[PDB]
Every structure is written in structure tokens, then in C-alpha cells.
Structure 1
Amino acid sequence: MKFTVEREHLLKPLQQVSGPTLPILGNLLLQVADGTLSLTGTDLEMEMVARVALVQPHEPGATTVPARKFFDICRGLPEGAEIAVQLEGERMLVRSGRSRFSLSTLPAADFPNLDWQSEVEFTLPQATMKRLIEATQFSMAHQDVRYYLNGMLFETEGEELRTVATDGHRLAVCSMPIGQSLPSHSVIVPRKGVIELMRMLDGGDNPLRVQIGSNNIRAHVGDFIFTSKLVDGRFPDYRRVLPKNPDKHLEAGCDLLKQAFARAAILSNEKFRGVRLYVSENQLKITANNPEQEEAEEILDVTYSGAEMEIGFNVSYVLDVLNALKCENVRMMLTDSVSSVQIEDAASQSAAYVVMPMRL
């Protein structure tokens, strides 16, 4: 196995595959075949494959090498450098100018593979997939004993793709049109997979091709291919989480609401930061207090209809929403002091957020 390639052509591929307990999982698979260098990183749950065209003389074959070391060496070389690689048994030689490196190797034969069959396929702009994941990702559970919440629902319905994420306390749902008639289907992508998929997306104009199997999801963009296993459980139905009949509607500036929440939060309990909301005619009052007897009060002029009520919220849950909205005005749709609240951009139905109240 021998190739010579510009450092420049390796950098972004290396960045992506350095993404995805067993030493060989810390290695990259390198393969030269039919004029192409392929670089694969895996963690057994997901894999990223990148391809680089080889115009300079090259010899087929494969090996695996320490990924972080190989990446650091390449990154470390000067801009414009050319990188010549040759496999020498249990070592891979790397040369560029008067810099020389010998890396240990593990056999390509030992490198783990994920085969499976695609059941649902569609293409969409990167930008749309990025939008979907950013709108919802923060509501994924992290290390919940209900495994199926540690990730993100991808659902196809009609001509829309939809993401849903929830941790049982707050929920986020976003739908975007994809312009193709689609089968009704739902899968759960593990959180680490969501994160790696999002990192593959640079917001250039580039179609993303998605293929969903019973147990896997694959996304193709440019010369990269990402594959993850799916999470095997029963995701909650967002439709059953949306408040059935909110009778109280508050509209307020997103930024003013956010800043009042953030300031009030300073004098909330540091362990469990919550604030009390009091809604009344034309007005929202946010209050916090702490074990030191300190108190914050914010009063905001707001658009409001409904009965007066008091309701508490976890500060981070609301700030997370207001941060994901990045819009001028926000609508909060309330029911009562013991029920969850629906938050959305006042001027867009693309996404919705549901948040349980917090007792204070």
C-alpha cells in the first residue's frame, strides 16, 4: 500500500473520521483501491468513511494506524506539504520533506465492520437536516436508563421529515418539507450519532442522501459516508405531549424574556434553578429566591390573554428553548399551574417545545 497525497486533501477527511475500549477502535482503516484512498473510523456503534482521489502513483492495499497520531502528524506538517505513505509490514512510514514517521499498525483484516438493507431513502439539503437537529438536539436525554431517550427520533410523514427529542421533562419537535412523498416511518438515532451527523454538515449547498434500515441509518454528503446503528425502543408520541387545549396565551420578545429569565436565575437555588412566573393582564413577573433569602424580581410588559396564574419553571429548560428559537417574539401557550407549556416562535410553526412546570 503506497500513496502520495497533498496534506490539504487529507485534513477534512481526517477531521471527520477521527470522530468514530478496544485498541483497534483508536485506529483508522486506510485502503487504496481503484484510484481512491478511503479512511474509516468506527466505534462499533457508528462509522465514518471518507474518500480521497489519488492522482499520484499509488499501490493498492490496506492497513490500520493510530488515528489521533496520524491526524496530528498530518495537521502538524506545514501548509502545502505532500505526504508520502508506504506500508512496511508492522509499520507504516510517513514522509514529507525531511520529516519522517513510522507508526505501528494493526491488520486491516482485524478492523470491525458494521451489512444491512435500506428500507427508506430520501435526499434533502444539508441545511434542512442541520435545521432539524439544531432545533431539537438540546432536548435529548444524556444518560437516561430509558436508552431510547438518549437520542433523537427521525420520522417521515407525508412530505416532511421530523425530529423529536425529549428527556421526559421537556420535549422538542421540528418538521421541514422535503418535497418527496414519503412512507410513514420512525427510527431513533443514538445521541452520539446525532452529534457526529451534525458535525458532518458544513452548511454549504450540498444534497444529503439518507438511507434508513431496520437497525441502521446512513447519510451520504460529498465524499463522506456516515452510518450509525439505531436505538431499539418505543419513542414517546409528541402528539400526546402537546397541550390539548391551552386557554392562556402569552406573547413576548424572545430576547427580553431570555434576559429576564437569566437575570432572575442568578438568585435562584444553584442546585435546582427555577423561577416563578405570574401572569396577569399585560404583564409577566418572574421571581427567584435562594437559601440565603436573596430575591430577584423581573417585570415585563407582555401580550397576554387568560386567567391570572402562577407557574414555576426550570430556568435551563426555558433558556434552552429561547436559545433554539432565535426569533423576535415567542408564544407561550398555557393551560394551568400544574400543566406543561408549549413555546413556539410567534411567526413560525416549524418547531414546537413543551416543558413541564417546576414546583417552587
Structure 2
Amino acid sequence: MKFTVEREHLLKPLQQVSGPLGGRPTLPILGNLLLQVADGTLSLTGTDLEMEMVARVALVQPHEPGATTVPARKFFDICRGLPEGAEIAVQLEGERMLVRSGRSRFSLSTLPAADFPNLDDWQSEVEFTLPQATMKRLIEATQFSMAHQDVRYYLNGMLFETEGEELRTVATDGHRLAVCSMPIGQSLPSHSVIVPRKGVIELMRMLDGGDNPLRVQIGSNNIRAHVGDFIFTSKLVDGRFPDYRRVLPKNPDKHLEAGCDLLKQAFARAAILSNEKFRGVRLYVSENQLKITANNPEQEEAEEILDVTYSGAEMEIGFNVSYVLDVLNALKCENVRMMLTDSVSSVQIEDAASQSAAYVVMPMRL
């Protein structure tokens, strides 16, 4: 079982797999990583019983099938110690593996690979492939609305829905809603799943500049994404999610159109004297006029006036400036359309150019 490894190739995958691994083992073998050889590739896998990450590296020299477990810390230290450019020779000799770095021979303890909690058989309920750009855009536009720590555990993640030839990401936290839709060009069964925060953030982290498409397959209880030479597998909350379309206001009478940059600057300027803890502002909308008022616990007040395209009845609405600013920043467009019904109803925000993504904010009642 002779394996020749180059430090340059081995460096980055080792750090990637060791990333999720933490100091606290919680199990004798959890800290250890599984190294296996199949055909002409070597797979290094690491998991913490919640998420699994496996990286594959091509092999050219002749070899035979095998699989073992190696501690992560010792292997990382050995790799770091060796000078850059060194070639590592790894052999299997009994219960302890042999590492031959030049004239230095090291014996590393090996635990049986049959006891490693690694998934053996995978069944895909729905599988597809997409460019990294689309997935990155959807995640970036829908991530900021996820709840962090809430009693409603089903709100602590992102809802991925495949419908016909459309992929939809939904995020909610009880006060704001973000929905994004994008065509995929393939017909898929109607299916909805929930991915927790950890899976989404890990997927975003591992995702890089669009070079090759990534393939995502979702089964009964798990989701596995393969990109380049990495595969990341996670499990799902499975707690059911509220229907977003119900949350969206029905028949919004009042429509307003404005410039994204002007509104962003106005909100940023008004937020200077806004309440630090609450960050509350008041909007008075009248015919082709929008007045933004901010108050401070120190009795300070700020007022701004802007010109917009509006023709409905005068309205006064309270809002949280931080959420509006986040929505405007994520939207990243030129013209913004706001749909509202009354002073005690949620307000929807979209782009005049296209309706690919929508946001909803619930006003604060004083």
C-alpha cells in the first residue's frame, strides 16, 4: 500500500477537512479522519456526526485498495514539520502505518476503519446541477434573513424548494421575509426541504468563484453537494415551514417607486441619530413626497425629505431602519418598488426591473 504524496497537493485539502474538526473530540475516533484509496483516487473524509466533508485527490502511481483512520492533529503536525516541497511515502504495515520522510521513519497508530461513522449507500430523491454563480447569488440574497436562536426551531434555517424548473430560497425570522426564485432549466418534482444555519454557512464558505458547476442531491433525510473535488453532506431539520405566499400581502393598493441609491443614503443619514437599541424611524408618504423622521433617547431629532413617484393617500408608517438598509443593500439595484396597504400592514419591497426576488418587512406598532 505505497502512497506517494506531494506537500503542495496535500496542503489545502488537509486544512479544508480539518476545518470542521475541533479541539473537543467527544469520541475516540471522531477526531481521526478516514483515508481510503479507490481505483486511482484517494479520499480523505472527516465528520462530527452532524456534517461530513470528503476531499478526493487523483493518484497516478500504482496502488491497491485500502482504508484506514489517522488522527488529524498528528498528521497535520507531521505535514507542517516537513520542509516545503518534500515527498511523503505512506505504507500500511500491520496496525501502525509507516511514514518515510527522507531517512526519517515514523510509526503512526491506526484504528480500524469499519468503526468510522461514514455513510455507505446514498439514495437521491432529487438531484440536479447548477453553476456556482446562481447558488452563490441565491445564498447571498437569502442568508441575512435567517433567525439565529429562536424557540421556533423550523425558523432557524433556509427553505429550499424545487418546483417545475424553478429553485426558490426562503428565509424568515418572524419579523422579515426574503424570497428568491431562479430558473434552472431542468424539470424537477415539487419538493421542499429545510437546511440549518451550519449547512448553509459551510456551503457558502466552501463555495468559491464560479469555475465548475456543483451538483446537489437531496434524499429523505440528507443533502449532499459535490463541487470540484469536495463533497459536503448535511442533515435536515424536518420541522415543516410556513408558506411564504401567505405572508406576502394580498392586493397592495399603494405603490411607490424610488431610486435605490437616494433611499439608501437618506436612510443611512437618518440612522445617525436613530435609537441605538431599537433603530426606529417614521416614514410619512404623501403625493410625490417621502419624509423620514428619526428620534433619539437623548431627545435628538433628524428629518429628511425626498421626492418619489407616489399618488395615493397620505400614510404614516413606523419601521426598523436596520432591516430596510439591509434589504436595500442586498437588493443592489437602481429602482426600488415598495408596495403597502395600510399603516398596520407588512410592506413588500421589489425591483422595478424584475421580480426575481422579493422582501417583506412588518412595521413596528407603537
Q: TM-score, normalised by structure 2?
A: 0.87
**Aligned 8 A contact 2:131 2:210 in 1:** no
**Aligned 8 A contact 1:210 1:218 in 2:** yes
Matches of 2:335 and 2:125 in 1, distance apart? 40
Deviation (angstroms), 1:90: 7.6
Tell me the alpha carbon deviations over residues 250-282 of structure 1, each in whole angstroms, 9 at most, x when there is no partner.
222222222322232232222222221121222
Matches of 2:134 and 2:80 in 1, distance apart? 31
| Closer, same or farther: CA 262–67 of 1 in aligned 2, 3 Å | farther
1:101 paired residue number: 106
**Aligned 8 A contact 1:3 1:59 in 2:** no
| Closer, same or farther: CA 83–181 of 1 in aligned 2, 3 Å | same
203-212 or 135-144: which moved more? 203-212
Tell me the alpha carbon deviations over residues 18-73 of structure 1, each in whole angstroms, 9 at most, x when there is no partner.
34444644443222332322111222222111100122465654444454675576
**Aligned partner of residue 124 in structure 2, secondary structure:** coil
What residue ranges of structure 1 are gaps of 5+ in the alignment?
none
Q: Which of 32, 36, 41 is residue 31 of structure 1 equivalent to? A: 36
25-34 or 152-161: which moved more? 25-34
Q: Which of 131, 140, 143 is residue 149 of structure 2 equivalent to? A: 143
Deviation (angstroms), 1:359: 3.0
Matches of 1:94 and 1:243 in 2, distance apart? 65
Tell me the alpha carbon deviations over residues 227-258 of structure 1, each in whole angstroms, 9 at most, x when there is no partner.
11111111011110111111122222222222
Matches of 1:308 and 1:241 in 2, distance apart? 25
Deviation (angstroms), 1:85: 4.2
Matches of 2:202 and 2:195 in 1, distance apart? 11
C-alpha root-mean-square deviation of aligned residues, in Å? Answer: 2.8
| Closer, same or farther: CA 69–147 of 1 in aligned 2, 3 Å | farther
34-43 or 149-158: which moved more? 34-43
Tell me the alpha carbon deviations over residues 183-208 of structure 1, each in whole angstroms, 9 at most, x when there is no partner.
11111111111111222322324222
1:234 paired residue number: 240
222-231 or 28-37: which moved more? 28-37
Deviation (angstroms), 1:76: 7.7
What residue ranges of structure 2 are gaps of 5+ in the alignment?
21-25
Deviation (angstroms), 1:116: 4.7
| Closer, same or farther: CA 249–7 of 1 in aligned 2, 3 Å | farther
Residue-pair matches, total: 360
Matches of 1:24 and 1:263 in 2, distance apart? 55
Structure possessing the higher radius of gyration over alpha carbons:
2
**Aligned partner of residue 242 in structure 2, secondary structure:** coil
189-198 or 26-35: which moved more? 26-35
2:23 paired residue number: none
